Amino acid sequence: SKDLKNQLGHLESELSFLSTLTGINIRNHSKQTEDLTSIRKVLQRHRLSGNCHMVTFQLEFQILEIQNKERLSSAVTDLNIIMEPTECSELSEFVSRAEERKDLFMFFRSLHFFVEWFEYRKRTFKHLKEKYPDAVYLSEGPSSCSMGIRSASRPGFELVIVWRIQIDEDGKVFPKLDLLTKVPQRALELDKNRAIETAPLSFRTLVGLLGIEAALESLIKSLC
Amino acid sequence: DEFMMLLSKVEKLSEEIMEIMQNLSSIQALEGSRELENLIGISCASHFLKREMQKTKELMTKVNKQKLFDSYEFLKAILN
Amino acid sequence: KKRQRMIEVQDELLRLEPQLKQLQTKYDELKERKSSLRNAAYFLSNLKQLYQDYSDVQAQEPNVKETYDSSSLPALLFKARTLLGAESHLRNINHQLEKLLDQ
């Protein structure tokens, strides 16, 4: 029976290695089948749960395997996935679209890319916050959308930077970086050169020039 | 100690929050088209705030009383 | 004899084309790099000067109730998100909280 324990250990190690390699941790799975035959037609109903890093999911679907003499065609006739109720509404509407399309692989790929970009955004915010406690006001949180950069001595001048993650109709994921300026008028009548109205385009050129963190570091040093 | 008293005062002050929310017409003008509500992220809606906030209170007390407060190197790292 | 000359001049042209193709491209991003770099330097200098200039008038008059115009309106409404999104924040906090209770 010791050898049997050896196979159990080997299988557990292989499962852990594969799960950490792909990034999907799969929980229990249940299959219930019903044979509805007229050329043979077989139907299966599946149920499995799991999670991917922060995100957790549980989904139920069924496939119709139309066996015949020369082809084995199986189509996912019905899909149904349910999400934990977070505020991430864009993920929910992507869930709705994928449910309408009835595609399973695309859902997993898009979920991976989404959570991956989310992890980058959160870690970048946390790192730049811990770098400069004195010039960063993380109003809503590191795992949230926007950022606030302000001076402690004076709250009049402040610029807000927004980081958003968007899922396209086709399925691919892409972020976008913009900013807004909370500026009192007194500064506007103060300086005549007045290039802050061009701030969006110039900021985007700067961030595309040499990177994201570099541009933010330069801006925060300039503000200080 | 100080955490509860700030909770107590906002309970008596929350009623005024809905009044100023409903007195101003432009807040109600925000709803109606979903296109701006996409930018805010979900939607603008303040209807069951009173019901939701009071639920937080007793469960907060339960928290208080029950005291609820490279590839190769990566690949070889988990293989062991 | 002439056929061989035709073949070898064709080889010459076929080899020469990629080099021009690469060089033109390289110049194309180099010039844009220079222009964008100069623009970014100008913008950063101007914004730093503007903030340094403003860093004195507020100290001179700290008791003035600063107003804002339509330019700062997007920032103001984005700050108002925490006010209106407070309900969603509350539900998120709760849904986190019964997770501890269930454990």
Next chain:
Amino acid sequence: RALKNVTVSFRETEENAVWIRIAWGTQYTKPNQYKPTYVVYYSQTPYAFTSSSMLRRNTPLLGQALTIASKHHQIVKMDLRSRYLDSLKAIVFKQYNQTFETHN
């Protein structure tokens, strides 16, 4: 344009291949139908298989034609010759080993 008199044929084959037959001639001779050249070109891929009968005289010309028609800059001859075109194909596309260990 390089030669004057030449006959070339095409037979679009299934499974993404092309068969070409070429009868060689020049300005002052009619094409020789006894000694043709066959080439099998797999589109979208860098490989083409040719038969060595009389191609020694016009090898650079056929090389240029192939590299121009398919939009490629350079061409070289692999030192691998055989009489079994399918074995050559399996080796060149390296698909002679098709056993994969899976648990399903």
Next chain:
Amino acid sequence: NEQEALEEKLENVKAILQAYHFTGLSGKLTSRGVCVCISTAFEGNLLDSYFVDLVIQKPLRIHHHSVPVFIPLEEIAAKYLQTNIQHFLFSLCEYLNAYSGRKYQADRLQSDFAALLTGPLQRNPLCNLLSFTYKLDQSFPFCARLLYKDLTATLPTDVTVTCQGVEVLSTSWEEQRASHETLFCTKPLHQVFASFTR
């Protein structure tokens, strides 16, 4: 006793792995290393699957595989193989799914709607350039040219259809061809045909 629980654990993990096969990509551990499997499906229709065999010793190599030649594995391998292996796997998954979907669209159109098409459509192994001439039953002779400039997408980027065989005599033809240009770029290929047939 112990044997029953041990058999339960074995069947549990075996069920978990075959279930884990449904995520899209799965792997098994061998002596040399891992053997990965890539699954391809379009619109819920399961399709072919592809294998790649990896060697773990530094530097990572590829022993043998079954991805087709005309797909660019070499560029992706050179660019992402040595670092961030999982992103390499996901990029390969995208490249394979897009190709399978495009080929499925073309083949299903050919199989189903042979009535409307006049001649066989033009197509290439990688399936990124389609051209066909279709007549719908008044009779409107139209010829189209679809270009998929992006190899990770299943919809053409540049599409053009022109009326040939007769000079335009009614604005109806012009609005029809404009609608066709929008439809081909927006919607899947085989669905649009079934749409305007009915």
Next chain:
Amino acid sequence: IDKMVETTELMTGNIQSLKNKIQILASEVEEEEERVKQMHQINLSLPELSQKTLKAPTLQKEILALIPNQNALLKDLDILHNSSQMKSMSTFIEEAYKKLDAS
């Protein structure tokens, strides 16, 4: 043969001209980038965002676009921010968030 040799001569002349032009431009960009490096530092290796993001429509332009008749509406949100209750509840939400991230 004459046509091809004329073409190849023209092309190699163009290649040489582009070569010395790009050499001059590459020399030129260096002092400017060094000068801009005077106040800014030389340097989580995040991949650069695609040009689709950079050339996407700006947020501020669309924000100004979708909204008519701002002034009266934005006047009231200033008073809303002036409300101390909003600041108190926002600070409570923020400190509650810190009660979750530190765990």
